[model samples]
Target: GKITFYEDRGFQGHCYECSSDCPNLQPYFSRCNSIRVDSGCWMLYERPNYQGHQYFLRRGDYPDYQQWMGFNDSIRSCRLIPQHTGTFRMRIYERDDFRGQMSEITDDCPSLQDRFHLTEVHSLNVLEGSWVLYEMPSYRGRQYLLRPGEYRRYLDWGAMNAKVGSLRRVMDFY
Candidate 1:
């Protein structure tokens, strides 16, 4: 039962609780080669109220562990699993980084259409692969690859501030 927990590299959010039952459970980030030391495997889950957080997991239990306390220091919690090779479901605020509503397009302007278009252009010259476009002023005039797949069209400067305020509930697919 040599379980070890480490900080969540990219998995951050207002996660309620992570269940040990994800159907297609895949490590969201790179973990130490294999879970060596058959003692136990520890998993870290970010608290719901502690959303937009980060943490490092450690093996065994420690009462004075500071990371388990609050923010600034570390926003992570550790849970010992009943078994290994089992899947777990994480109740996380999916796409937490993506926020704000799609700007309303009153016209079919090329730039406006590209702002809301969900289709990817093969060569930036011709629209090809599937694309999901969103504009956040924070990321204006630049492109960023986001989780769940899609190119972010950061055209609005205000999206930077608005994104963290309100989130879009619509999950669209091409």
Candidate 2:
């Protein structure tokens, strides 16, 4: 199965052209273009680029994925293919957790945190929005961007659940 990860939009980074929001990375490379440190989910771009791909190696669940970079002769043209092949089960974390919270609140409505139930019972991987496109032949999912309205509602509910307060408490006035 061939899964299409994120796509490269008009992303331009202050970093090197070979890296940072690059959109030219081949199929072998899967970029996690998360603007925040905690999330690997894509906010922009349709696919992973050089910087996102490299970041995955450094921060991804499997450090060995770096070896897959060998497929590319140099960082300029580096690409990885099926890096997960033959590897044991892998785990990945996204910033969506509290670190990368994009929820907000206003007088009229709630935010992402408010509506998103932290309780396991309410959580499901349904069409809550796209994360990454898995083109595993039959597998496919285009990551969804956080709808402001949806996130606003989530934030409203999160306040009641003390998640908002907790975030501020731990981070000190977030």
Candidate 3:
């Protein structure tokens, strides 16, 4: 998997190429306005040390920051998401500590409330593949990457509250 970050739009200006997780990207460039993903999916961070706002990108060409849903041109770290095949599974619970109404998901969800008749998801168990939890419906707003694991509460998934509007699988390009 190869991802090249361009300092300017239209693939111009100094660029940096990465094939794996990069904790700190300050040495490579000052700001990132464009990006080209040749093979794998990636999670880009706004600050170093894998902190701050994140943008999930797949194999594609982003000529500008907005194309990747970036708030600004300040990208400082990146993580190449491992590809997944076969199936994607996860269980979202309405209450904390895996309690309350629960729903097993095997695919993308554009609106949790519409399908589950609930919106506040407090706990989760990721059985397979990674997922992105959105703050609003239709995969918009804040994104929280959920790796295969157990999250006892919304805070465990790096969210301020348990208001998940949507969810998406981070699978291989298919």
Candidate 4:
């Protein structure tokens, strides 16, 4: 997908355009006040090299940083999220290495703790489609994208701990 980041709000000021992953966007602009997604989906990082807070953006116009739920004006990197279509399936574990109690989910879970009677998710097996893990209930807080694969531990998903509060399937708009 094609994306453009503006240095000022309302699509003003110097801008940087990209169609692929950018490890470091500092060369183009110091900060991003607005953005426009011309096609596909994208993940924007708050720090360079794809490390730090992330915000997912689909094809649309974001007149300002707030439109994308940006924590700050700084956006240091970005990467495209491949579009796909299929049923969603995942198995979350309460312990590391796929051990302990497990729960399967094919639909969105707004409160994992309420469903499983546990607040932690140590490991996961993503069987189909892409999914987003939220740190807080109702899809709030930090978000982690999980494609079809096995995550032996929360660390594998770049999480410091296994405190997943909600989860939802990632759908393609195009």
Candidate 5:
């Protein structure tokens, strides 16, 4: 999918459109106050080279930075999440490197606290479909995109902590 970034609010000013990873987006524009996701899901980084805070943006219009919970109206990096279908399956572990208590889920988890009776997730294995892991319950806080693969540690998904509160599949919007 394609994502467009605007330097000014309401999708105005210098615009940069992309459908792949852009490690350094400083050349075309400085900051981004508005964004438009033409297709697929995307992750926007606050710093260059896919570092710093991560913001998940699905196909839609974000009129301003605040709409995406951005601290600053700047986006230095981006990654287009590959769309997937079929069932979503993932295994969660309490310890890193796929150790400790392990649990599996194929459906949306509104709260890990209720299902797993735990708060931290150290490792994970996404067996099918794309998924989003939320830091807080009810899909709030930092969002991490997970494809079908094994994540040895929470940091493997760019998470500073293993505090995963919720999870959901990235289903088709259309």
Candidate 6:
């Protein structure tokens, strides 16, 4: 996957082209007001080491941060999310170690509370495909990228807590 970060908006100013996952991109650019995704789905973190706010992106032109619903012009880290299609399966548990009130999902969930009556997920088992976990319903608020593997705790998924409001598979949705 290829991604370009711009210091200023509209693809102008200093640009840094990244071809792989970067946990700290400050060495490439001090600020990121605009971005261009050439391939694969991706997630941008506002803080270095893949922490803080996250922005999900697909291959396309984003002249400004607003185009991607970004809060500001600061992107410290990024990741090229692995692509997936067809079957998307995951299991969420209310308690750690995959215990207590488990539910399986094979599609996008706008609101975990509305569907599964789950407000917080302590653990996750990603059986297939990649997915994003939102802190608020309707896919809003903080985001966490989950790969196809087991997340024994919320900390494994780079989350500060266990609150998850929604879930969506990583794919070219356009």
Q: Highest TM-score, which number?
A: 3
Tell me the whole-model lDDT of each prediction, alpha carbons only: 0.26, 0.23, 0.91, 0.87, 0.88, 0.91
User: What are the TM-scores, per candidate, against the unseen true structure?
Assistant: 0.20, 0.19, 0.96, 0.90, 0.92, 0.91
Top-down TM-score ranking:
3, 5, 6, 4, 1, 2
lDDT of 5 by residue, 131-153 (tens): 88999988888878787899999
Query: Candidate 4 clash total?
Result: 0
Write one digit per residue (lDDT tens) for candidate 4, span 50-76. 878788888889998879888999999
Model 3 misplacement above 4 A: none
Measured over all alpha carbons after superposition, the RMSD of each candidate to the real structure, in angstroms, is: 15.6, 16.7, 1.0, 1.7, 1.5, 1.6
Residue 171 local lDDT, model 1: 19
Lowest-sum lDDT 10-residue window in model 6: 79-88
Q: Residue-pair clashes per candidate, as listed?
A: 26, 41, 0, 0, 0, 0
- lDDT per residue for candidate 3 within 108-156, as digits (tens), equals 9999979988778889999999998888888998888888999999888
Displacement of the residue 104 alpha carbon in candidate 3, Å: 0.5
What tens-digit string does per-residue lDDT give for candidate 2 at 1-174?
Answer: 111222122222222212233356444344422122221222223333433212112212222212222222223222221112121211111233333333322211122224444321111111122122121111111112222122222222222222221110001011
| Colliding residue pairs in candidate 3 | none
Task: Mark the 10 consecutive residues where model 3 has the least summed lDDT.
Answer: 154-163
lDDT of 1: 0.26
Off by over 4 Å in 6: none
Candidate 2 backbone clash number:
41
